[PDB]
Design a protein around this ligand. Structure first.
Ligand SMILES: [Cl-]
Ligand SMILES: [Cl-]
Lengths: 298, 298
């Protein structure tokens, strides 16, 4: 499906009933609603599932904008408005979680519950990016820091992401335990056939809140995380082992620090947890919605 | 662990933080808490899990009793009382569901929620045993009816179940889609080394509420089903295809007739759904409990 949004368009996948609660599925970099393809059918029995492609991603429009975090904020807000969604569960990964947290902070009453994984938080130092404390994960964590430092460097970032397509070709498969089939990988490639098309994919790592910068995003996410910590709505945190942005020991501590946040351990997993754990995530989210709906207002 | 119950004892598996809500896992014929072994670890993070072995099953005592449905009721009540459990979620399959429905009918305030599958219901005619409307299933359903009619026949039942051990050796593996490993099958055999020890296994099919008989169980399960249909507590129904006691079409209609009952389709499955869907069931139940607990007292 397609929705007109701010003079452009956003593509979205939709499934479920009509009178069911809405669940918005929010992808990150460099994915699209494609990543939820095997999860949607497991949640559709209990909810009206809506999975937008972020502006510049998947089958959405490609306007000549900056593709900064606040650009995605604006386009997602306009999409929510266009679709007439007045409240929803949020299910999110990667930059999807930053969008979810910021949305929940501004509109606390909108959120029925938040299910999240491999999420973004303000990172005081580069050592906080891919922070982990177990064996051969440090090789992988340090490399991830080196690659992302370069992504954030003028000229270098352009060469890696726009020219060499490294986020699609390396980082993505790098964050999935199993090897995708050709037919599963192809829809990740099709939105990005050219250097210019890859502008949003380069913009996102330059938005990551690291060592206080970019300051506008860093401050907004500090604020969003304060609101999350004070929030009362149901939460579900998924973690893989060793994970990427979120290590198991951190996940445990983080979930315990919040109000009403359950921790679900998935097993072997990196960044793109949906591709290795579609069944487990789908079944968990579906049970969770069913339980909340069974005791919610009525 | 072991608890003294009515002059005998019941074995039970226990896992999870003991300040968490309790979940009681109730197995049926001819199984034990063994059947939950791959589900417990998935529910443990959100609940204090208690999985008893029914009297005469698993590692429980083998007292000199009839092992009728109401013997199980009395022993399970006495177990719950001994453990000091004042409310619980219930997760149940087979005769476990009959005990669950009956407990819920008598003590609905005890029931935090009920997750169930392949459940027993009053069956007016033998055609309601393994009831199916699907052409290709009719042969299988008729074969099932033929064996259970024999189990219920004086003399013949004893030869099949006590002498030849057919419930353990044929019925159990017959209701699992995969083939259990030798190490997974062994603990299903060890409770039943002798014809004498198999008395509870023979008692159960003779308790099934078919064509009005035995009248006590039939009437109790008639009332319990009316209670279930009116009940307001959260419920989850799991189904397999084709299932055994519950067909997919029936599950759908049944779930829809209930209040606050979500339907979870597992895919290919017969009667002992835990052995084929441990991860899906565990993940769903854990999510459901997490969701209910997040919205409870507040
Ligand atoms: Cl990024
Ligand atoms: Cl039986």
């Amino acid at each position: 499906r397609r929705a007109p949004v701010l003079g452009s368009s956003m593509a979205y996948r939709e499934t479920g009933a009509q009178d069911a609660p809405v669940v918005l599925f929010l992808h990150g970099n460099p994915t699209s609603s494609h990543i939820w393809r095997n999860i949607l059918p497991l949640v559709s029995p209990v909810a009206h599932c809506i999975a937008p492609d972020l502006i510049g991603f998947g089958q959405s429009g490609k306007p000549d904008i900056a593709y900064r975090f606040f650009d995605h904020v604006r386009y997602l807000d306009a999409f929510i408005e266009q679709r007439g969604v007045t409240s929803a569960y949020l299910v999110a990964q990667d930059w999807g979680t930053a969008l979810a947290f910021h949305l929940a902070a501004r509109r606390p009453d909108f959120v029925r519950g938040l299910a999240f994984m491999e999420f973004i938080r303000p990172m005081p130092t580069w050592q906080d990016f891919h922070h982990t404390e177990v064996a051969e994960e440090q090789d992988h964590a340090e490399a991830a820091r080196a690659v992302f430092r370069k992504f954030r460097t003028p000229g270098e970032g352009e060469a890696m992401i726009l020219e060499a397509n490294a986020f699609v070709e390396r980082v993505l498969p790098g964050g999935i335990v199993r090897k995708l089939g050709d037919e599963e990988m192809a829809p990740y490639r099709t939105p990005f056939p050219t250097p210019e098309s890859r502008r949003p994919v380069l913009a996102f790592p330059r938005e990551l809140p690291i060592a206080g910068e970019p300051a506008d995003v860093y401050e907004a996410l500090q604020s969003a995380h304060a609101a999350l910590a004070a929030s009362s709505y149901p939460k579900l945190l998924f973690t893989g082992e060793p994970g990427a942005l979120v290590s198991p020991e951190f996940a445990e501590r983080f979930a315990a620090s919040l109000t009403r946040c359950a921790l679900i351990r998935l097993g072997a997993g990196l960044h793109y947890l949906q591709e290795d754990h579609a069944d487990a995530i789908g079944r968990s989210v579906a049970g969770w919605i069913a339980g909340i709906e069974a005791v919610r207002p009525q």
